[PDB]
Design a protein around this ligand. Structure first.
Ligand code: SPH
Ligand code: SPH
Lengths: 58, 275, 178, 252, 252, 178, 275, 58
């Protein structure tokens, strides 16, 4: 019941092993490898989006 | 593996395209890249927005309160100590949590217990290892009123025992809210006629901890001081808000004195002078 | 001016000759007192290294019948501060015309020796000077107010980063919050 | 051009000619509560024409020395028709909103408003260990007013513009869904606001969902012959309003 | 058997055990107004749970010498929740009804009620060239009472049971949708009543749509040890209620 | 009346006019003193959160020749207590006729802000009021007793839940059981 | 993964179906769903009857008895202590077990041992770590009558040794009944002529524990107090019964004083008044 | 000799590993994942069952 995933290494130059030992999901370690984002709801939060080259309020 | 965006090369331009002219009056943040104004080269950028995520920012253990209790006294209320559970008595963990309005996280609790022999006439003793008991009471349970009270039996309540000299005790705690997120701020009242208390003090309701020495009356007083460390893990966070400028005053309200917005310069234009 | 809302207003008006300096600060998002308490300054004050570009947006809050021009210059360090408009136009700059589109963007390019600066102040990683100058004056018609207000904005670009956690230098408590 | 905008919600229509755009929340448009996120078990009430329509609040006058205004918004519509009645007869309410703010001038006036829509704006008090009365956090459709200096009234909010009554920097207050009313380009500011709360439905008297704030950064200024009285008029329309738990009228 | 009947309209349920049947109008079950018979042009309001539910009126006591009672019915539900509020805020109303009347006894009591539902029961006056006040035709949920003889009060309806206040023979009053409450077989009387008017929608204050009448033909009678207090309880539920023309609250 | 078997009997009889209140309690299975010691109150008193619907069954223990009607109303909070039969018939109610089928069921619907209430008392999760009113009186023939007895029942529906363990507030010992 | 039942939608009804009319005189609980009386919507309900099962309800460690014994005395009976094994001397674990009449479970036993130096003139000693011995005697075995008795050898009897400062000792115990379930209540006598003792005291017969200090006579008295924690696991339970209203009196019978059925109201109808 | 089974997680958004180490079945952990029930012997304990819509004692 083991899982292999890559480590945090640098660029231009791994595979640790994790096994969960407790019956609850609240005992698991922190999920410190989710690097995704979406700033489309804080920047650009408008209706009728703008095209960055047009005067846009033309 | 998600990189940041590369810088694309550009050349000279002369046209009716205007990326620099915009209007911030629509509440819109301009998406201007440096390759839209000046001539830039091609840069393969390998930076990772890794240690800025909401998981990596909050998942650090933080002292939330100091709990002090003794092992022999004249008055029985100083032989045990209790704490109504909140994260709002130390300003660092509070100000880190108040970036967001609603949060959802599992908690990891670690206790650090240290013992100091108090000053007395008979300090030359041979004391065996102290054992401490940390009992958590869910909201509504019976309250112990002495160190020898029969509510310390922990038939249903969670508890932990630590013998002196070991590693600190650690347990995990799931998401315990009756709603869908821990409300960091609650703009509202407690009663339906809009009276009572105003603020987040209605939605706290998390229970309270209890601390005592399992050993009986010793022949010398020893002051125990246990520190509670919270670690928020498995974090989700919603609807951000600006950080606090002013210094806090209390735990139950949000009230303050007005503070200046920033530090003064005493001039408005820089120069090559004493600046 | 910090104990009011006047700290946000940049005073600007019609000049006598030309070519005077409007305002100025140093590019330190997290150590400079101007952009210390800004949101970029707060989030960068929970970090110790930073990298990437910075947008500066300027909104002109004057009247619909007034015109004017400005020079928004960036100067990388090594020399001192540019002392006139002639020394300021030798760096990364932009001429902004005030018209229908009411706001301009000065996108400060990432120009550095290393990959990361420091958020706190040191001599080794110094970043430069943001300065603003009168290209042409503010010409206004009759029965219209002369003195107007520029507002300023800051944010990060899409290539921006932070690396090292630390505690904020702003949190100062002495006792508990009973 | 895209500066002309028209909005029809029910039997009320707003036509503007110098609009800018429309900010829609955090990208989410107001919709009804699904059966997966639902908690209560009984049938809700969806009026949808007698409720979802524009209600016009009081106009406030903007002098050169005005500092700001705020309205609490599940509570400023207490006495506005069948929205207020359906608030008084039900226990659980859930709605989105559309906030349109009118302010007009000429091409000779200058100034700049900031229209912010702040969720969970839990405000401070004037005296630190003191209780705030409900007549000062909210007053219905009559606006409360910020002050320029440190106010120290009895049972009142700390009214200082450089802290917005909440203890933050007022320049950093643009993280919320906002627009500007710039008097050289704008005439109005439309903000579509979905339902943001920690629970799927909530009572509409005991809770304050959000707080509209209008704060002038660039002060109003004009010459010696221009018009002095410049009003500011706020109009609000609930969206996707539904109601649960019918019982007798009251709030106690 | 078919004597047990159960009715659920909204969050209210009536279970009876000695019912008889259900009279449904003139064969027509209450339904909404179609687009072919519609006259107004704007969207109606259909609450359908907060409105269509059973409202319980006042209980009236039936002595041996009681003569009768009547209630006007778009008007007796003036102060009954969101039906009454939606009546007060709209101009045009349209609904059907379901009238359930409870009266219980034992197997030692005798008597017989007649529950009639009379459309357009334009009543006479006590004095012939005199005007009737509105407090005597209707009083809300409080019942008016017939009299056994020729009543000659001021500004009052002619209250005589053998003319039903309308000038006809009371034995011929069974042409309307009716049931009997016979105390040896019945316990209750359910009458489903659709919308009957000359126009598709009408105002619910200026008009009285119909009139419930409960008249005891066989007088109540019992022995020297049986229970004396026998109440009569009326419960009504609007059906297919919709509303048109929203404006401010009032009636003038 | 708790030191007898009379605590279970709901007194009911023939009335003078109509429309009086029979009994009443608050919907708190585990904090209200009426349904505290019931089996639902015991099992809910070993828990701290609860959720789901509640059945209330009323058995009429009078004579075979007597008739009557009752109004069994549920009122969610926010207002106060309904003070007459007119304010009680604006909520979730049912008219119950006494006949051959001797018992009725008032099934209290789950109407709540949250997903779970609290078993102990707090202002935030309040649940409402169970009340009972005379629709029509009790009509009885001659030589039959007038005053009769209603019995009441409670149970949980098929969508009911409990979440948090705790110790019961009822167990109180001082010494051991030698 | 077993969910609770969903709520199905319903509409208006007028027919001879009567779900609300029933008869509880047949001992039958009505299966009335809220979609049978009022108009309900469709609710996808995700609640799980998880922490209400008989396994999750009883499997909690509970203190059953406190055992006290010393390390040097004048009288030899106060240097060791014994306990006839029953679960009926603490009211919490007893009242949790008395929901059912017959039970079948494995037991998990944990001992918590704490030592307190008694008050004397020569408290300034240097005592090495105490070692305790907990010997279980199955029913019928030989009984030790001193701390130096030769029955403490544990040639066949189970035993456990604990040195001071470690984790608490823990062992598991299988199902030990001679019948098919632990009879929580026994309505009957001991003798066939219906005399003797009345109650569950005939079917207890579980053995008894013994506690002593492995060390010899020390030069200072130390009072040891060991607490026994039972944890019922692998649980099966049969034929439920109502919980106890009255306070207990003894361990061997079920006897009581009459208590009122519930707490009084002093009125019978609610109002909007001082209620 | 390992066994993989799911953890207790919430709705709308696992796989721990267990190995038994002792020779007896009385040493195993508690069986805290049996969520089944049958209230047909406490509710509805009768002969000639009732159909919930009929008068049932008709
Ligand atoms: C003895 C074993 C159990 C230990 C119990 C100690 C802590 C119990 C509560 C768990 C942590 C909850 C702390 C509060 C969480 C949120 O941050 C606050 N509601 C405010 O956001
Ligand atoms: C020293 C190692 C062995 C430890 C022996 C200690 C306990 C021995 C007995 C095991 C537990 C039985 C306790 C009684 C079980 C039932 O609850 C009772 N018969 C009443 O229900």
């Amino acid at each position: 019941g083991a899982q292999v995933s890559t480590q945090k290494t640098g660029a231009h130059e791994i595979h640790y092993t994790n096994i969960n030992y407790y019956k609850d999901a609240a005992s698991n370690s922190a999920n410190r490898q989710d690097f995704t984002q979406d700033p489309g709801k804080f920047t650009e939060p408008v209706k009728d989006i703008m095209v960055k080259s047009l005067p846009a309020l033309n | 593996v998600v990189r940041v965006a590369d810088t694309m090369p550009s050349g000279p331009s002369n046209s009716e395209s205007i990326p620099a002219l915009t209007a911030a009056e629509t509440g819109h943040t301009s998406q201007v890249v440096p390759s839209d104004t000046i001539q830039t080269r091609h840069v393969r950028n390998f930076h990772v927005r890794s240690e800025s995520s909401v998981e990596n920012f909050l998942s650090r253990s933080a002292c939330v309160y100091i709990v002090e209790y003794k092992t022999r006294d004249d008055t029985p209320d100083k032989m045990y100590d209790s704490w109504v559970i909140n994260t709002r008595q130390v300003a660092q963990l509070r100000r880190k949590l108040e970036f967001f309005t609603y949060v959802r996280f599992d908690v990891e609790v670690t206790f650090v217990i240290t013992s100091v022999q108090d000053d007395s006439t008979r300090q030359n003793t041979d004391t065996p290892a102290l054992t401490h008991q940390i009992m958590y009471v869910p909201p509504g349970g019976p309250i112990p009123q002495a160190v020898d009270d029969y509510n310390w039996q922990t038939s249903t309540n969670p508890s932990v025992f630590w013998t002196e000299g070991n590693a600190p005790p650690r347990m995990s705690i799931p998401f315990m809210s009756v709603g869908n997120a821990y409300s960091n701020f609650y703009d509202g009242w407690s009663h339906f006629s809009q009276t009572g208390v105003y603020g987040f003090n209605t939605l706290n309701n998390m229970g309270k901890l209890y601390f005592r020495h399992v050993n009986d009356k010793t022949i010398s007083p020893i002051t125990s001081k246990v520190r509670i460390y919270f670690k928020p893990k498995h974090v989700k966070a919603w609807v951000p808000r600006p950080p606090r400028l002013c210094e806090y005053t209390h735990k139950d309200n949000v009230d303050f004195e007005p503070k200046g917005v920033t530090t003064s310069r005493t001039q408005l234009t820089i120069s090559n002078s004493t600046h | 001016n910090v104990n009011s809302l006047e700290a946000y207003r940049i005073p600007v008006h019609s000049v006598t000759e030309t070519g005077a300096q409007v305002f100025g600060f140093t590019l330190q998002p997290g150590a400079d007192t101007v952009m210390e308490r800004t949101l970029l300054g707060e989030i960068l004050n929970y970090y110790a290294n930073w990298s990437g570009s910075i947008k500066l947006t300027f909104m002109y809050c004057g009247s619909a019948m007034a015109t004017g021009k400005f020079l928004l210059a960036y100067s990388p360090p090594g020399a001192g501060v540019p002392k006139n408009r002639r020394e300021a136009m030798l760096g990364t700059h932009i001429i902004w015309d005030i018209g229908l589109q009411s706001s301009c963007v000065l996108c400060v390019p990432w120009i550095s020796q290393t990959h990361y600066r420091f958020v706190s102040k040191d001599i080794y990683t110094d970043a430069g000077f943001i300065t603003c100058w009168y290209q042409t004056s503010i010409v206004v018609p009759a029965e219209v107010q002369n003195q107007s207000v520029i507002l300023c904005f800051v944010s990060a670009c899409n290539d921006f980063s932070v690396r090292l956690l630390r505690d904020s230098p702003f949190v100062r408590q002495t006792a508990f919050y009973q | 051009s895209d500066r002309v905008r028209s909005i029809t919600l029910g039997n009320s229509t707003i036509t503007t000619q110098e609009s800018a755009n429309v900010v829609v929340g955090y990208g989410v448009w107001p919709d009804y509560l699904s059966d997966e996120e639902a908690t209560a078990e009984d049938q809700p009430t969806q009026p949808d024409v007698a409720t979802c329509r524009f209600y016009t609040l009081d106009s406030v006058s903007w002098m050169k020395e005005s500092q700001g205004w705020w309205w609490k918004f599940p509570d400023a519509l207490r006495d506005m028709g069948l929205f207020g009645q359906n608030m008084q007869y039900h226990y659980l309410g859930r709605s989105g909103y559309t906030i349109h703010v009118q302010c007009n001038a000429s091409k000779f006036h200058q100034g700049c408003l900031l229209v912010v829509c702040v969720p969970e704006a839990e405000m401070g008090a004037a005296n630190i260990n003191e209780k705030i009365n409900r007549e000062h956090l909210s007053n219905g459709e009559v606006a409360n007013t910020f002050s320029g200096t440190k106010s120290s009234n009895t049972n009142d909010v700390q009214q200082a513009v450089f802290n917005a009554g909440m203890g933050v920097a007022v320049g950093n207050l643009t993280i919320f869904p906002h627009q500007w009313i710039n008097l050289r380009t704008n005439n109005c500011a439309t903000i579509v606001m979905p339902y943001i709360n920690s629970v799927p439905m909530d009572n509409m008297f005991r809770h304050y969902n959000f707080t509209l704030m209008i704060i002038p950064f660039a002060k109003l200024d004009y010459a010696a012959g221009s018009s002095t009285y410049i009003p500011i008029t706020v109009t609000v329309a609930p969206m996707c309003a539904e109601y649960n738990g019918l019982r007798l009228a009251g709030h106690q």
